[PDB]
Design a protein around this nucleic acid. Structure first.
Length: 692
RNA sequence: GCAACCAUUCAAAUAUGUAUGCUGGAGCAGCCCCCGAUUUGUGGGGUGAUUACAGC
RNA sequence: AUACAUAUUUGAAUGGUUGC
């Protein structure tokens, strides 16, 4: 239990962790401070007070020296216990206590209740097992620390306590992934695109893998366009809905509202910002994939100049330029005005149509849809409109089937003279949401079917009181320009008779990928119904956007194709590299390719008879797991050797060093000699090595 | 042929926090209808607005 | 009830280990 109780061969789990800390300190000497500050870069709120931050900044040499001392202590049979003492004074102790209390707070505040206590890092001026685990965490990948904690925890009886304690102790540990300089998001996007493409389009699923539920084209397109074009940045959303262009938070969601995004293009003399729809986005992706991205972005950048030129000469400009201008501009210059009579007719027809459809659909409509309709009726009949609180309260009643409380609400509005007795009364004969909804539809349609009076024009929103100056509207418009639908199409494919889908198909066939979707083509067309009927248009468009997404995936894989000197065979359901076959999805969030020598030796030494393609699962079970098992035995053996004693020597040192550092830099013959010397000195183990 | 343990992915259920209204402007954008059409069209209409909008 | 985030439980698919 206490750290003092780990003597001789029992030290092994700590030997492995601390040697890895040194392995990693030799790759990067800055890891203590890097790890301590990792999370605080993402926090407005200080993780540390000012003096703590100061101590952290000075601590590299101290922490690196302590790392070496403990590695020495844990790698020897007998070492002086002095290194296990941290005084109250100790810089490292203060740092550790602050970092730990911070981690606990971070854990607890995300839980619904406080269930457990956390282990102390210190007892008097002596580090505990938990303290030693915490110290090493700063230097090692999550998998190393989990392996250590798994060996030394007294807490595994209670799964919940074990995992929460582990969460705190492992707060500051490195990501498993060697390649990740926190820009390996292309790996995750690759997997996400493949996962989405493998889901069957909803409409095809219902007719004939999981079902696709969400269209993620825009999300993928934004990640791809930002990766390809450093001049471009899309609006991110936060709720205080605020749109900003900060790339400080990677997790932060893109602003996507009704298939619109906000783009900022930084060219020439400074950034220009536009709203861009799905239509323009998908053409931009298509153009980017074919190497015309820079040119497309140049044309979008210049778009505002054209608008500004047209704005001065609306009356005289070519009618073709009217497309770039909102109604209010054209109407100001006497273009496309409609008689109030015509505006009334269109408005009333629409609102009538909306309410006839609601009336027909009551039984099929959601409680939210029905509640909104009922509230829209009450609100429009109120002297003073609902405040947010009043609205919320009544909505909660309707959604919760609390018709009694809703009717008590109407009574209160009546007693307050906000609604008249008629409005209260029309609901008195109803007991259900559906009945109330029908009554409301009837009252509204009665109002809309009247011979056109002054009250009607106001009711349907044609009655303006407040006058905004045209010149204010123009100014607003100029800072809120949206790209005309079909803009990029007209700039690049003016005289093209090929639709979007055919342009995508032509690029796919001739572009050099030689890929297509891995879903059966039947999932993109219902053979039994006409080309243009039902879901067939939407599925055909989906085939084109999926093909774009496949090409985006092919671009992303390209980045990790650039990294290292290993070939890729990429299938729908596997990646093969020189061979190891990663299954499930792509890898199943795996790595291992970063140490090619080690993977080579793992395969050579633990799987000598296997040739050609080997499953990752097999490499793990027969290789990495087998290595880990052997490593425990060799470290335990080496420590027991030291205890007892306190070409053969060469081999012993090399094999020892290999197992201490988690590599295979020795030959089979050399393990023979190591094994011989262990046998000669009393310490046997069931080596299970070398392999048949 | 079956069970247990570990790892990975998907679906479903439960709890907690936050949001949901009004007025004016905005329909270049998004969406829908009609008209064509191996399908998403710088073809015609709409859309009491869904809002990088201003206030209460 | 809808949207978003966090946490917990169950089932299904895949591989390995153990027992008969």
């Amino acid at each position: 239990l206490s750290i003092d109780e780990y003597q001789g061969a029992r030290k092994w789990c700590f030997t492995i962790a601390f040697n890895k800390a040194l392995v990693n300190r030799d790759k990067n000497d800055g890891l203590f401070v890097e790890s301590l500050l990792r999370h605080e870069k993402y926090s407005k709120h200080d993780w540390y007070d000012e003096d703590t931050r100061a101590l952290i900044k000075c601590s590299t040499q101290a922490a690196n020296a302590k790392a070496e001392a403990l590695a020495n202590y844990f790698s020897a049979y007998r070492h002086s216990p002095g290194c296990l003492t941290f005084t109250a004074e100790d810089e490292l102790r203060t740092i550790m206590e602050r970092a730990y209390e911070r981690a606990i707070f971070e854990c607890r505040r995300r839980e619904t209740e406080v269930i457990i206590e956390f282990p102390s890092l210190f007892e008097g001026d002596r580090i505990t097992t938990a303290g030693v685990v915490f110290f090493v965490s700063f230097f090692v990948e999550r998998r190393v620390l989990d392996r250590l904690y798994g060996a030394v925890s007294g807490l595994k009886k209670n799964e919940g306590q074990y995992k929460l304690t582990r969460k705190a102790l492992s707060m500051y540990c490195l990501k498993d992934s060697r390649f990740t300089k926190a820009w390996d998001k292309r790996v995750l996007l690759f997997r996400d695109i493949l996962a989405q493409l493998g889901r069957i389009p909803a409409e095809a699923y219902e007719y004939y893998n999981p079902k696709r539920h969400k269209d993620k084209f825009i999300e993928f397109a934004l990640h791809y366009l930002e990766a390809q074009h450093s001049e471009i940045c899309f609006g991110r959303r936060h709720i205080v809905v605020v749109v900003d262009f900060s790339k400080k938070d990677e997790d932060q969601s893109y602003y996507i509202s009704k298939n619109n995004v906000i783009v900022r293009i930084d060219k020439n003399a400074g950034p220009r910002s536009y709203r861009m729809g799905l239509n323009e986005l998908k053409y931009l992706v298509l153009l980017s994939l074919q190497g015309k991205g820079d040119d497309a972005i140049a044309k979008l950048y210049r778009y505002r100049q054209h608008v500004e030129n047209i704005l001065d000469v609306v009356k005289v400009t070519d009618k073709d330029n009217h497309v770039f201008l909102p109604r209010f501009v054209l109407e100001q210059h006497g273009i496309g005005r409609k008689a109030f009579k015509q505006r009334i007719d269109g408005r009333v027809k629409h609102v009538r149509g909306v309410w006839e459809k609601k009336k027909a659909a009551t039984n099929e409509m959601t409680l939210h849809e029905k509640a909104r309709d009922i509230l829209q009726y009450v609100n429009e009949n109120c002297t003073r409109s609902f405040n947010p609180g009043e609205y919320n309260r009544l909505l909660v009643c309707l959604v919760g089937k609390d018709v009694e409380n809703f009717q008590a609400g109407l009574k209160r509005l009546q007693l307050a003279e906000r609604i008249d007795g008629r409005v209260y009364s029309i609901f008195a004969q109803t007991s259900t949401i559906n009945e109330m909804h029908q009554v409301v539809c009837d009252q509204i349609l009665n109002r809309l079917c009247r011979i056109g009076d002054q009250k009607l024009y106001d009711y349907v929103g044609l009655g303006k009181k407040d006058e905004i100056d045209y010149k204010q509207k123009v100014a607003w418009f100029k800072e809120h320009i949206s790209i005309r639908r079909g803009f990029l199409r007209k700039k690049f494919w003016y005289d093209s008779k090929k639709g979007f889908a055919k342009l995508v198909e032509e690029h796919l066939e001739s572009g050099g990928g030689q890929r297509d979707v891995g879903l059966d083509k039947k999932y993109y067309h219902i053979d039994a119904i006409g080309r243009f009927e039902g879901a067939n248009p939407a599925l055909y468009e989906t085939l084109a956007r999926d093909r774009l997404c496949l090409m985006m995936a092919q671009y992303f894989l390209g980045s990790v194709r650039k990294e290292l000197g290993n070939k890729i065979v990429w299938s729908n359901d596997s990646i093969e590299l020189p061979s190891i076959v990663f299954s499930v999805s792509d890898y199943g969030k795996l790595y291992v390719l970063d140490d090619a020598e080690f993977l080579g030796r793992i395969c050579e030494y633990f799987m000598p008879h296997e040739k050609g393609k080997i499953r990752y699962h097999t490499v793990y079970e027969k290789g990495f797991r087998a290595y880990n098992d052997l490593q425990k035995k060799c470290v335990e053996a080496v420590l027991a050797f030291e205890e007892k004693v306190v070409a053969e020597k060469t081999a012993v040192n090399k094999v020892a060093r290999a197992f201490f550092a988690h590599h295979l830099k020795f030959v089979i013959d050399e393990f023979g000699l190591f094994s011989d010397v262990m046998k000669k000195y009393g310490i046997e183990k069931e080596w299970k090595f070398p392999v048949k």
